[PDB]
Design a protein around this ligand. Structure first.
Ligand SMILES: [Mg+2]
Ligand SMILES: [Mg+2]
Ligand SMILES: [Mg+2]
Ligand SMILES: [Mg+2]
Ligand SMILES: [Mg+2]
Ligand SMILES: [Mg+2]
Ligand SMILES: [Mg+2]
Ligand SMILES: [Mg+2]
Ligand SMILES: [Mg+2]
Ligand SMILES: [Mg+2]
Ligand SMILES: [Mg+2]
Ligand SMILES: [Mg+2]
Ligand SMILES: [Mg+2]
Ligand SMILES: [Mg+2]
Ligand SMILES: [Mg+2]
Ligand SMILES: [Mg+2]
Ligand SMILES: [Mg+2]
Ligand SMILES: [Mg+2]
Ligand SMILES: [Mg+2]
Ligand SMILES: [Mg+2]
Ligand SMILES: [Mg+2]
Ligand SMILES: [Mg+2]
Ligand SMILES: [Mg+2]
Ligand SMILES: [Mg+2]
Ligand SMILES: [Mg+2]
Ligand SMILES: [Mg+2]
Ligand SMILES: [Mg+2]
Ligand SMILES: [Mg+2]
Ligand SMILES: [Mg+2]
Lengths: 84, 81, 102
RNA sequence: UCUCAUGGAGAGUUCGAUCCUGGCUCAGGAUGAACGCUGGCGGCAUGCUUAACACAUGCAAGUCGGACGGGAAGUGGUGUUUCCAGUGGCGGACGGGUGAGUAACGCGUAAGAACCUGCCCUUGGGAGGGGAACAACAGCUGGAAACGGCUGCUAAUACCCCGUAGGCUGAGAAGCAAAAGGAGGAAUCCGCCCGAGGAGGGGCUCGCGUCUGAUUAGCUAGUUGGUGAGGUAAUAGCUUACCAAGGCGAUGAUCAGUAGCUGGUCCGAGAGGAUGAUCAGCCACACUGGGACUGAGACACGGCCCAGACUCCUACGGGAGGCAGCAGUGGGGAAUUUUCCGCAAUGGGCGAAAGCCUGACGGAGCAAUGCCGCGUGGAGGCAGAAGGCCCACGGGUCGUGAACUUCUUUUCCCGGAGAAGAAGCAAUGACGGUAUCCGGGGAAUAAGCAUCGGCUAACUCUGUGCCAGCAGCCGCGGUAAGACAGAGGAUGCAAGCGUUAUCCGGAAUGAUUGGGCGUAAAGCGUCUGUAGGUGGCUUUUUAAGUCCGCCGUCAAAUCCCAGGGCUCAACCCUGG
C-alpha cells in the first residue's frame, strides 16, 4: 500500500539490483485500469538478492545518481503452502 | 521573521483591512497561513480572535505600530505575560 | 564636492575582506602541506619511531589553530572545519594503521 | 398523490420530386480587443497581445553622529548646537518589471533525510590583558576629464596576538578555538563572544500528473555500478584513479519543433473542450555571453571583473553607459495613457529616539475598452388645420405624435454649507472645498445605429434595367425588383449600434457518456502465431482495486448557498 513491490530482474551490478515495479491505475478519459511499468535501482549491501526473487523497496537518502531506494523483504504474502 | 500586520483588500477610497500573520519579506498581498482578525476605520468593528494571536506572539511575532495599538486597547498583553 | 555611493562602498569593503579572507585561507593551505609532505616521508621510511610523531603533533596544533581561528572569522563554516580537521586525523591514522602502531 | 430534476430547440443547401448519407453556412455567449457611424452624466474595473527593438531628460535605496577620527557653518568668530566626504554597522538577494529561455522535481499535489538560517522569540554561560595598520587629513605630484601617484601622522563596535572554554577533531590519550564597547540625573537600556532550542525562510531527494511528430529507432562512455582518495552547508560521478558492463527505449528512448506553470478564465445539459491579460503563488531572465568576490543569504535589474556589438564625451593619450523600474520619446503595428500630486493611509529599510528615504503603494488626469446604474420629461391634449408618403382617389398612415396647457427638476446653471478616512492627549488629509446636504432659476442641457428575400421579428412606392451593385448560406438584378440605390413606414437594440478577427457551442461533424465499415467513405487476399487484452464452474486465503466510517491536506481571491454594507445594482465584506 505505502511502499512499492517489484521484480528484481537484471541484478548483475555490484551491491545493486535493478528492479521492475508494476502498478495499475484507471485511464482518465476511459476509466480502464492499465498495467504500467517503471524501473528503479536499489542496493543490497549483503547481496542477498538475485534474479527471480520478490523484493520490497523503501525510501532512503540518495546513494548515487538514480539509485535512491533500499531493498527489503516483503511484508504481506500468500504462500500458504498446502493448507486444508 | 514573523510579523503581525494588515493587508488592504476592498474598494477605491473605502479601505477595509484584515489582520494576518505572514513573513516580512513577502509583499503586502502575500501568501497567508493564519488570518487572526479584521478591522476597518470607518465602521470601527473588530473581532480579533485572541487564541491564535497569542500562539504567534509566544514564538517571537512582532506587531506593527497600529496593530500594537489595536492589541493595546484589548487586554491581551496582560494575559500574555 | 563629490557625493556618496553606497554601492561603491561595498566594492571597497569587499576587496579588503577579499585580501583578508584570501590570505586567511592560504594559511590553512600551506600548514597542511607541511603535514602531508612529512607523512609521505615518514611512511616510506621503514624505521618505526614514536619520537618522530612529536613534530607532527606540533604541526597539527598549528593546523587546528589556523583552522579554528578562521572559523571565528567569516571565511569557513563550522562543518567545513570539521572536514578539514578530520582529513588530518584520518590521514594521520593511515600511517598509524599501515605500520605496527594501530 | 413523495422527492429528485431548473438542464440538450433548430434552419437553408445535392434531386423533376422523396427517403437517407455527408460536408458547407447561420441563429447563442465571450474578448487585454481593433475599425466604422454616433455620443449626456455617474460608480466599479481595465489599458504594447507586435520589435526580450533601440533609448534623450528626471526620479525609482538609502540610513545611523547614541560606533570613530577629522572638517564646515553659526554664536559673544568661546559653551550648547546644526550639517557630512571618509572608516565602521545594517539594508542594497525584499519590493518593482518582463515571459526570452525551460518539456523538467520547472510547476501542481503528496511525502522524506543527509543540511544551512542575519534580524525576532526562548534559554545556559562569558567579555581579562597588550600591540600593529589603512582611510580621512597634511605636503609634493601626474591628468582634458573621469580618476590617481608618492612621502609621513591618527581613532574606532575596523585589524592582530596571548589567556580562558558546557564547543570542534579523534578509538582514546591528547591538540585547537573566542569577545566591543556606546548613551546616562548612574542601577542599566542598546549591543558584542561561545553553546542549546522554537518559528519563519531557503537548499536537496522521491511517488503521481504535466504538448506535437515514427517520412526521427537506436541512444549514452563519467555513460550505469562499486571501492579508495577528494569535494559541498549537506546526500549524490558533484570530481578524480582503477575495476566491473551495465543504464534508457517501440507503453515511444534519442532527435526535431512548440510552450513559462498553477490557482483559475470562457464555452458546455453534462461529460469535457479551449485558454493561462488584469488579481494571487512558484520558477526563470536583467544589452548579448562567461566568471567570481562580498555576505546568514546572490552567481546580484539600478554591484564588480573580462570579451563582443551599439551609443555618448575626448585636449585622441583615454573614459562613460545598459528603462524587460515610473513617466516619456523614436521605430514597428489595426491598436492600448500624464515627461502629474503626495508619503495623509497601508507596507518596507535604517535609527535608542526625534526623524530620513520609499515612481512600492495610495490618489488625480486621458480613453464608451468593458460591466452596472440614471437621464435625454410626466399628465391632459375636444374638434380642426398645414406638411411628408401611399391609394381602388372615397380616403389611409406618419399621428396624441406635434402644437398647446399645466406639473416636476435626477441632470444642467447660479449661490452657500460641508465630512468620514486619523490609528496616537492635542495636532498630524495627497485626494479636496472631493463626496454629500440646503436654497434659487427653469422642459429648460441631452438619441442615435442596424435591419426589414427565407434562416430572422419587420413593406410598399420611385429610380435603375444581369447595368450600377447587394450577399453569412441558398442566391437576387436582363422594364412593374418585398433581395440593388432613394424615400416614407415598420421592427429590434439603445449611449451605444454594427463590421472584422479569435475560442467554445450548435457539430452525435472523431460519437467514454454518444457514431459506423453488404451496396452511400470504411474488414488486411488468407492463415498460423510473439508481446498485449480478455477469459468456464465450486470452496477457502489475502485485502491491491472497489465500498463505508474518521483524521490531515488541496492557500487566499474566484465559482456555489446564506447574511450584511455602499440610496439600488455592478461591486465590497463576514460565515460555511
Ligand atoms: Mg434546385
Ligand atoms: Mg509584451
Ligand atoms: Mg549604535
Ligand atoms: Mg557621514
Ligand atoms: Mg546581512
Ligand atoms: Mg587565541
Ligand atoms: Mg555526469
Ligand atoms: Mg558509493
Ligand atoms: Mg517562449
Ligand atoms: Mg454539446
Ligand atoms: Mg533591450
Ligand atoms: Mg541589486
Ligand atoms: Mg535600469
Ligand atoms: Mg517604462
Ligand atoms: Mg509612508
Ligand atoms: Mg510607515
Ligand atoms: Mg528621494
Ligand atoms: Mg469605439
Ligand atoms: Mg406626451
Ligand atoms: Mg418575417
Ligand atoms: Mg444592404
Ligand atoms: Mg422598379
Ligand atoms: Mg432596399
Ligand atoms: Mg462533439
Ligand atoms: Mg456516420
Ligand atoms: Mg461504388
Ligand atoms: Mg463503398
Ligand atoms: Mg491467431
Ligand atoms: Mg479555496
Amino acid at each position: 500500500m505505502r511502499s512499492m513491490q517489484g521484480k528484481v530482474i537484471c541484478a548483475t551490478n555490484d551491491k545493486t539490483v535493478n528492479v521492475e515495479v508494476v502498478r495499475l491505475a484507471p485511464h482518465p478519459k476511459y476509466k480502464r485500469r492499465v498495467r504500467k511499468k517503471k524501473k528503479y535501482q536499489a542496493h543490497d549491501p549483503d547481496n542477498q538478492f538475485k534474479v527471480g526473487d520478490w523484493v520490497q523497496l523503501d525510501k532512503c537518502r540518495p546513494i548515487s545518481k538514480t539509485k535512491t531506494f533500499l531493498a527489503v523483504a516483503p511484508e504481506g504474502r500468500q504462500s500458504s503452502a498446502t493448507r486444508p | 521573521m514573523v510579523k503581525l500586520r494588515l493587508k488592504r483588500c476592498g474598494r477605491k477610497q473605502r479601505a477595509v483591512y484584515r489582520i494576518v500573520a505572514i513573513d516580512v519579506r513577502s509583499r503586502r498581498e502575500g501568501r497567508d497561513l493564519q488570518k487572526v482578525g479584521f478591522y476597518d476605520p470607518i465602521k470601527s468593528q473588530t473581532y480579533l480572535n485572541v487564541p491564535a494571536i497569542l500562539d504567534f506572539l509566544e514564538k517571537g511575532a512582532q506587531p506593527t505600530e497600529t496593530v500594537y495599538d489595536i492589541l493595546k486597547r484589548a487586554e491581551v498583553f496582560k494575559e500574555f505575560r | 564636492l563629490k557625493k556618496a555611493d553606497s554601492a561603491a562602498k561595498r566594492t571597497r569593503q569587499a576587496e579588503t575582506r577579499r585580501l583578508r579572507n584570501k590570505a586567511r585561507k592560504s594559511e590553512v593551505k600551506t600548514r597542511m602541506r607541511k603535514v602531508f609532505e612529512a607523512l609521505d616521508a615518514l611512511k616510506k621510511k621503514s624505521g618505526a619511531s614514536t619520537e618522530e610523531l612529536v613534530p607532527i603533533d606540533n604541526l597539527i596544533a598549528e593546523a587546528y589553530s589556523a583552522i579554528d581561528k578562521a572559523v571565528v572569522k567569516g571565511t569557513l563554516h563550522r562543518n567545513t572545519a570539521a572536514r578539514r580537521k578530520s582529513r588530518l586525523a584520518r590521514n594521520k591514522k593511515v600511517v598509524e594503521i599501515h605500520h605496527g602502531w594501530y
